[PDB]
Amino acid sequence: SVDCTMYICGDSTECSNLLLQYGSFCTQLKRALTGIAVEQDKNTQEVFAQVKQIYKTPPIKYFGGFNFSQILPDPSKPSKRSPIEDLLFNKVKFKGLTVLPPLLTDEMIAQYTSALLAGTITSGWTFGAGPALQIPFPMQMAYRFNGIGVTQNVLYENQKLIANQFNSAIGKIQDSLSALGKLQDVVNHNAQALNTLVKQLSSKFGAISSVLNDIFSRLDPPEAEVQIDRLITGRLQSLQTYVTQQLIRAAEIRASANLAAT
Amino acid sequence: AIGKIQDSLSSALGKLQDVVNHNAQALNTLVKQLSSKFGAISSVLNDIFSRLDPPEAEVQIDRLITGRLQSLQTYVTQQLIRAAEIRASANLAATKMSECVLGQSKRVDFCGKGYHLMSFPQSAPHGVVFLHVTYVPAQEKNFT
Amino acid sequence: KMSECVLGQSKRVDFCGKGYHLMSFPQSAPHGVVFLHVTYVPAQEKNFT
Amino acid sequence: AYTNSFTRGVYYPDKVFRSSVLHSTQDLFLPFFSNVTWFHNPVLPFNDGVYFASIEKSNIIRGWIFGTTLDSKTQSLLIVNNATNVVIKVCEFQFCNDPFMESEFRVYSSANNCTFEYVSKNLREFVFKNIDGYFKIYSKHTPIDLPQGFSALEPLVDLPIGINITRFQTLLALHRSAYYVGYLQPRTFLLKYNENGTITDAVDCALDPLSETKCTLKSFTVEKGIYQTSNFRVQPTESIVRFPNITNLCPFDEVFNATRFASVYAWNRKRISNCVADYSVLYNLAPFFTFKCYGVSPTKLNDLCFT
Amino acid sequence: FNFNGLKGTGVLTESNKKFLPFQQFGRDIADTTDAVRDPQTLEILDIT
Amino acid sequence: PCSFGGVSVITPGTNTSNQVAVLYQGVNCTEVPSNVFQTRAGCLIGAEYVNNSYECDIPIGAGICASYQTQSIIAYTMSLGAENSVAYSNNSIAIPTNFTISVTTEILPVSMTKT
Ligand SMILES: *[C@@H]1O[C@H](CO)[C@@H](O[C@@H]2O[C@H](CO)[C@@H](O)[C@H](O)[C@H]2NC(C)=O)[C@H](O)[C@H]1NC(C)=O
Ligand SMILES: *[C@@H]1O[C@H](CO)[C@@H](O[C@@H]2O[C@H](CO)[C@@H](O)[C@H](O)[C@H]2NC(C)=O)[C@H](O)[C@H]1NC(C)=O
Ligand SMILES: *[C@@H]1O[C@H](CO)[C@@H](O[C@@H]2O[C@H](CO)[C@@H](O)[C@H](O)[C@H]2NC(C)=O)[C@H](O)[C@H]1NC(C)=O
Ligand SMILES: *[C@@H]1O[C@H](CO)[C@@H](O[C@@H]2O[C@H](CO)[C@@H](O)[C@H](O)[C@H]2NC(C)=O)[C@H](O)[C@H]1NC(C)=O
Ligand SMILES: *[C@@H]1O[C@H](CO)[C@@H](O[C@@H]2O[C@H](CO)[C@@H](O)[C@H](O)[C@H]2NC(C)=O)[C@H](O)[C@H]1NC(C)=O
Numbered sequence: 001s002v003d004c005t006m007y008i009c010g011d012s013t014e015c016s017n018l019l020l021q022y023g024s025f026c027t028q029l030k031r032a033l034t035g036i037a038v039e040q041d042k043n044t045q046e047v048f049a050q051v052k053q054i055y056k057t058p059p060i061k062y063f064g065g066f067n068f069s070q071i072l073p074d075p076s077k078p079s080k081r082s083p084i085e086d087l088l089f090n091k092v093k094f095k096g097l098t099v100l101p102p103l104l105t106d107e108m109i110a111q112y113t114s115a116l117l118a119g120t121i122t123s124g125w126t127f128g129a130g131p132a133l134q135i136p137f138p139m140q141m142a143y144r145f146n147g148i149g150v151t152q153n154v155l156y157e158n159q160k161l162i163a164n165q166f167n168s169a170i171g172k173i174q175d176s177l178s179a180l181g182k183l184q185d186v187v188n189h190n191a192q193a194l195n196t197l198v199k200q201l202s203s204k205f206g207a208i209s210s211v212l213n214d215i216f217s218r219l220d221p222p223e224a225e226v227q228i229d230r231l232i233t234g235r236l237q238s239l240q241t242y243v244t245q246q247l248i249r250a251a252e253i254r255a256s257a258n259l260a261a262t
Numbered sequence: 263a264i265g266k267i268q269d270s271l272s273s274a275l276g277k278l279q280d281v282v283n284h285n286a287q288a289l290n291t292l293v294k295q296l297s298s299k300f301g302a303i304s305s306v307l308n309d310i311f312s313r314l315d316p317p318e319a320e321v322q323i324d325r326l327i328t329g330r331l332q333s334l335q336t337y338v339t340q341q342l343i344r345a346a347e348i349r350a351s352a353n354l355a356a357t358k359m360s361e362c363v364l365g366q367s368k369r370v371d372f373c374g375k376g377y378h379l380m381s382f383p384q385s386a387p388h389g390v391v392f393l394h395v396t397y398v399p400a401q402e403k404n405f406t
Numbered sequence: 407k408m409s410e411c412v413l414g415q416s417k418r419v420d421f422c423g424k425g426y427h428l429m430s431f432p433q434s435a436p437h438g439v440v441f442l443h444v445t446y447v448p449a450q451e452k453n454f455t
Numbered sequence: 456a457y458t459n460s461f462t463r464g465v466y467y468p469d470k471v472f473r474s475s476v477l478h479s480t481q482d483l484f485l486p487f488f489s490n491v492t493w494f495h496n497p498v499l500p501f502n503d504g505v506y507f508a509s510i511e512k513s514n515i516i517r518g519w520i521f522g523t524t525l526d527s528k529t530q531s532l533l534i535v536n537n538a539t540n541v542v543i544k545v546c547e548f549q550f551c552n553d554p555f556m557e558s559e560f561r562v563y564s565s566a567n568n569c570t571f572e573y574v575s576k577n578l579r580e581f582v583f584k585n586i587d588g589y590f591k592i593y594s595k596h597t598p599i600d601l602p603q604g605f606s607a608l609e610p611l612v613d614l615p616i617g618i619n620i621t622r623f624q625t626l627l628a629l630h631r632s633a634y635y636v637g638y639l640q641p642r643t644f645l646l647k648y649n650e651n652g653t654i655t656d657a658v659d660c661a662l663d664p665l666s667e668t669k670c671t672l673k674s675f676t677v678e679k680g681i682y683q684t685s686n687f688r689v690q691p692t693e694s695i696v697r698f699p700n701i702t703n704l705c706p707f708d709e710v711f712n713a714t715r716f717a718s719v720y721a722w723n724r725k726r727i728s729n730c731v732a733d734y735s736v737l738y739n740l741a742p743f744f745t746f747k748c749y750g751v752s753p754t755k756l757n758d759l760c761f762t
Numbered sequence: 763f764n765f766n767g768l769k770g771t772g773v774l775t776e777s778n779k780k781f782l783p784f785q786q787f788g789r790d791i792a793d794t795t796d797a798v799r800d801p802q803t804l805e806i807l808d809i810t
Numbered sequence: 811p812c813s814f815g816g817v818s819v820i821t822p823g824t825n826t827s828n829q830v831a832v833l834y835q836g837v838n839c840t841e842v843p844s845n846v847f848q849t850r851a852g853c854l855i856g857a858e859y860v861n862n863s864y865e866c867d868i869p870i871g872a873g874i875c876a877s878y879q880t881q882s883i884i885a886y887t888m889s890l891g892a893e894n895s896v897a898y899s900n901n902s903i904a905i906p907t908n909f910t911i912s913v914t915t916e917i918l919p920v921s922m923t924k925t
């Protein structure tokens with residue numbers, strides 16, 4: 001969120017009466033940025049908040065062999081993240097600019113993910129269409145092979161082999177991590193727009209100076225109104241560029257959130 | 263179950279109301295820019311061409327042209343940005359029309375919540391309403 | 407479409423051409439791709455009880 | 456005594472008809488829920504306009520007097536109304552210190568240089584203001600501590616006098632055989648017009664939070680949610696100007712008052728350092744000095760510094 | 763047309779608005795003049 | 811810098827009440843100049859913070875919402891949902907014996923106005 005008056009004018013009060021003479025440009029900026037701010041929380045709810053109840057796994061945590069400890073939460077942590085989630089988060093104020101916090105904390109998101117994991121491992125896909133119906137996991141895997149055209153005895157006669165091979169295959173995932181460039185790019189693109197927006201305040205745009213107080217200190221009002229009006233136009237153009245790009249870039253992350261929710 | 267739809271709608275069309283209202287607010291915002299100076303002596307051409315000689319009035323007219331042109335060019339850019347979104351929504355509505363009404367889909371949470379049986383379209387002022395009929399299991403018991 | 411129409415058989419209605427999808431073949435174009443969709447269409451219905 | 460106004464001192468800001476349009480205006484009003492003095496008399500200040508209400512079926516209040524000194528040697532206003540009709544007059548007067556058969560008008564004893572003439576329970580409201588030399592009066596007479604309600608006041612007269620006002624007094628009918636004074640401040644309201652063109656409601660946009668939300672949304676009904684309405688800015692106190700030391704006056708004397716200047720081809724350059732110049736010593740000596748500054752004036756840089 | 767200072771262009775027609783007995787002309791939403799009163803005959807006319 | 815930030819007003823709607831709470835965004839509650847509550851999103855004044863957990867009504871941020879329930883105005887931490895414990899075992903199954911037909915709607919915009 002950008003404070004239009006503090007970005008353009010900046011502290012000065014003689015400027016505020018001049019900025020009012022350009023109409024509702026500062027109202028448009030606030031409305032446009034609020035639209036983005038509301039959609040970004042809805043994007044997250046649609047991807048993760050697809051479960052009614054918060055499911056938990058049973059204490060034993062032994063599902064016919066298959067070992068899921070690398071994707072289930074670690075009870076010996078303040079954050080209750082999984083071992084793989086701990087790796088995933090280890091790789092990625094100014095002149096009127098502020099950053100608002102998300103509505104959902106990352107603890108709350110972790111609770112949606114653990115509910116999806118606990119629902120699936122114990123009831124497969126039945127809880128997404130109604131009540132959760134328990135079935136042993138080994139039998140869940142056998143139905144899944146049937147869905148791809150493999151006869152179900154292939155699992156039941158080879159249950160140990162598939163469970164042991166799976167456990168190593170999932171174990172290799174950490175080695176490939178210890179990738180997330182698509183997540184760092186989102187951070188970089190916004191950091192670059194905020195670093196550029198601030199740097200554009202040190203530009204004269206063809207005026208005598210770039211500071212709205214220094215103009216007055218060494219110039220009469222009749223001519224100072226012209227010099228300040230040039231700087232206002234230049235910095236107002238900066239805000240229009242910034243907000244237009246945030247709308248175009250927010251449509252791209254929204255399309256990605258729709259794919260992730262799907 | 264069909265008889266209850268009427269209560270749920272009468273007590274709901276927010277997605278259609280917001281797109282109509284948002285566009286009207288942008289068009290009214292465009293008109294409100296015709297009463298700003300944009301760094302000029304006035305906003306009325308009958309005052310710029312009446313208290314200035316031609317070499318002095320040209321400067322004030324350019325200030326109004328620049329301000330009003332900038333506002334109109336902003337208006338049209340924002341419509342291109344919104345136009346891509348309604349088109350994307352229409353492509354989703356066209357996809358559901360084929361896959362939910364002219365067929366039975368297995369895609370999860372694409373044609374309602376439950377197991378898709380059938381869907382019926384209804385027209386709306388600037389969009390389409392789908393009535394999704396799904397199968398939902400109930401009253402489970404445990405067995406061995 | 408390349409994965410779901412050419413590298414497999416789709417059941418999505420109208421997604422891979424009009425009719426019951428059998429197969430697709432890609433062709434290149436100067437700045438795009440052209441799909442040839444092969445579909446099965448029934449004909450000549452009769453009445454029964 | 457003092458009393459509490461509720462929603463009083465709202466007047467039609469101008470002509471211009473209008474229908475259902477929550478219009479936003481900035482002007483001089485009486486703030487809502489304000490502290491209005493009560494009188495049962497002494498000269499009061501003016502400062503910027505006046506609200507004046509009163510209650511009484513009979514007519515005890517017999518006009519007002521306005522001006523800067525309320526005395527001779529300068530112009531003043533005099534507004535009276537006998538049982539006939541209102542008679543405004545603008546002259547230089549000499550007012551009794553206590554101004555007040557059935558014979559009356561012992562108010563003044565001089566009427567020189569007149570620049571304007573004119574001839575022609577119960578709640579009688581008035582708003583007096585003086586802007587760009589115009590002395591406007593709003594009023595309304597509605598039959599029945601002030602009560603509680605809303606009613607917009609209509610303009611009656613507009614007088615292009617030009618006169619300045621800084622103080623005023625009142626005139627009362629004595630016994631021989633109660634009024635209010637508010638003041639106006641620059642505020643912002645959101646005014647609701649009906650289809651008949653009258654103001655039916657208002658919101659004071661500088662009163663409480665809620666009202667700021669209504670004004671920003673341009674409505675009188677706010678839906679549940681959270682709205683950004685304004686901003687918080689801490690303010691600085693005191694002005695601390697630091698420096699190490701040193702002191703002296705810049706030797707401009709020896710430059711301007713030199714007995715001989717250089718030839719232009721061999722122009723002379725005096726470098727200045729470590730002194731305090733009062734550039735206001737210059738500018739003076741008007742008969743043939745010419746000053747022509749490029750990049751700044753001579754008033755603004757006297758509060759500036761250079762290496 | 764020009765009505766004692768109000769300069770504009772348009773078609774004048776009989777109105778059905780009712781001004782207050784001190785108002786000369788009316789404006790619409792977005793603040794554009796849409797009705798005036800004739801100084802001589804005191805009748806409200808719309809401007810389209 | 812000498813602390814600045816947005817000020818937002820939390821309202822239940824004028825058709826419910828005229829009570830309001832005010833959030834000073836990223837302002838410390840010691841530098842503002844009853845009910846003063848410090849949140850990671852700023853300083854909240856005029857709402858009471860409770861230890862219960864409800865469904866989110868008016869979202870403030872960082873897991874905190876406000877509601878008109880306890881009346882008065884309160885703040886709290888949202889509830890994601892109930893808590894279900896599936897009776898899982900290595901030889902138990904649940905099978906439905908009945909079902910219901912359900913009907914839902916979905917609304918999608920297709921067009922806009924041509925200007
Ligand atoms: C699930 O896999 C984890 C490893 O990913 C197992 O935990 C490790 O077990 C080995 C011995 O087999 C120990 O040397 C490691 O110290 C263990 N790691 C940790 C973090 O404790 C775990 O035992 C497996 N679970 C089951 C039921 O086999
Ligand atoms: C099946 O039988 C029906 C009648 O039960 C046929 O309907 C005919 O439809 C044509 C128009 O296509 C009408 O002009 C005729 O009047 C109808 N006939 C009767 C008896 O009602 C239908 O054509 C038959 N279908 C096929 C494939 O032969
Ligand atoms: C500015 O003036 C003050 C006052 O003369 C200077 O203060 C002196 O500083 C020296 C060094 O610390 C001391 O030994 C003296 O006793 C100080 N004088 C007094 C009266 O306190 C100060 O140094 C000057 N600043 C500069 C930059 O020259
Ligand atoms: C302005 O003057 C005209 C005459 O020039 C007035 O017109 C008269 O209007 C009344 C009705 O109001 C008629 O009964 C008269 O017959 C009109 N006179 C003529 C000569 O036509 C008009 O009323 C005047 N306007 C005002 C506001 O006084
Ligand atoms: C399936 O049987 C289990 C028991 O084997 C039932 O789960 C128990 O239900 C009681 C309440 O009736 C709880 O107090 C226990 O804590 C439950 N046990 C566990 C492990 O969660 C369950 O209700 C039965 N399901 C159905 C659909 O009847």
Ligand SMILES: *[C@@H]1O[C@H](CO)[C@@H](O[C@@H]2O[C@H](CO)[C@@H](O)[C@H](O)[C@H]2NC(C)=O)[C@H](O)[C@H]1NC(C)=O
Nearest residue numbers: 263398399400401402906907908909910911912
């Ligand atoms: C399956 O559930 C339905 C209800 O969803 C049962 O039908 C109800 O039966 C009761 C008792 O006879 C009636 O009072 C209701 O009117 C019925 N509802 C409807 C919608 O018809 C049905 O009996 C159940 N089936 C079985 C085998 O138990």
Ligand SMILES: *[C@@H]1O[C@H](CO)[C@@H](O)[C@H](O)[C@H]1NC(C)=O
Nearest residue numbers: 456457458459460489490491
């Ligand atoms: C009005 O202000 C005076 C001080 O100027 C104070 O004594 C009085 O109590 C105030 N009135 C009200 C109603 O607050």
Ligand SMILES: *[C@@H]1O[C@H](CO)[C@@H](O)[C@H](O)[C@H]1NC(C)=O
Nearest residue numbers: 535536537538539540542574
């Ligand atoms: C009313 O007062 C005015 C004051 O100037 C005076 O001229 C006029 O004669 C008075 N009328 C009567 C009937 O006394």
Ligand SMILES: *[C@@H]1O[C@H](CO)[C@@H](O)[C@H](O)[C@H]1NC(C)=O
Nearest residue numbers: 527528547566567568569570
């Ligand atoms: C005002 O009256 C005085 C005499 O009282 C006179 O000297 C002066 O010229 C008058 N002013 C004007 C503007 O007539």
Ligand SMILES: *[C@@H]1O[C@H](CO)[C@@H](O)[C@H](O)[C@H]1NC(C)=O
Nearest residue numbers: 587588616617618619620621
């Ligand atoms: C009113 O007084 C101010 C000073 O307070 C002065 O500058 C101004 O010229 C005066 N106005 C008139 C009309 O005399």
Ligand SMILES: *[C@@H]1O[C@H](CO)[C@@H](O)[C@H](O)[C@H]1NC(C)=O
Nearest residue numbers: 649650651652653779780781
């Ligand atoms: C004044 O407004 C009321 C309420 O809308 C309406 O009924 C009435 O007709 C109006 N009066 C006139 C003279 O238009």
Ligand SMILES: *[C@@H]1O[C@H](CO)[C@@H](O)[C@H](O)[C@H]1NC(C)=O
Nearest residue numbers: 708711712713736737739740
């Ligand atoms: C020097 O300048 C000062 C100030 O302008 C003036 O008082 C003085 O007369 C000047 N000296 C001479 C010799 O002109």
Ligand SMILES: *[C@@H]1O[C@H](CO)[C@@H](O)[C@H](O)[C@H]1NC(C)=O
Nearest residue numbers: 676679822823824825826827
């Ligand atoms: C809004 O007010 C109407 C009465 O004007 C009432 O019927 C309705 O229940 C109110 N809505 C809420 C949410 O209180």
Ligand SMILES: *[C@@H]1O[C@H](CO)[C@@H](O)[C@H](O)[C@H]1NC(C)=O
Nearest residue numbers: 837838839840841848849850
């Ligand atoms: C506010 O300041 C106090 C110290 O005065 C500090 O203890 C507290 O943590 C600060 N609050 C925030 C939110 O930074």
Ligand SMILES: *[C@@H]1O[C@H](CO)[C@@H](O)[C@H](O)[C@H]1NC(C)=O
Nearest residue numbers: 847858859860861862885886
């Ligand atoms: C909420 O519970 C904590 C302990 O978890 C306690 O310290 C705190 O006082 C409680 N808050 C209220 C408002 O009772």
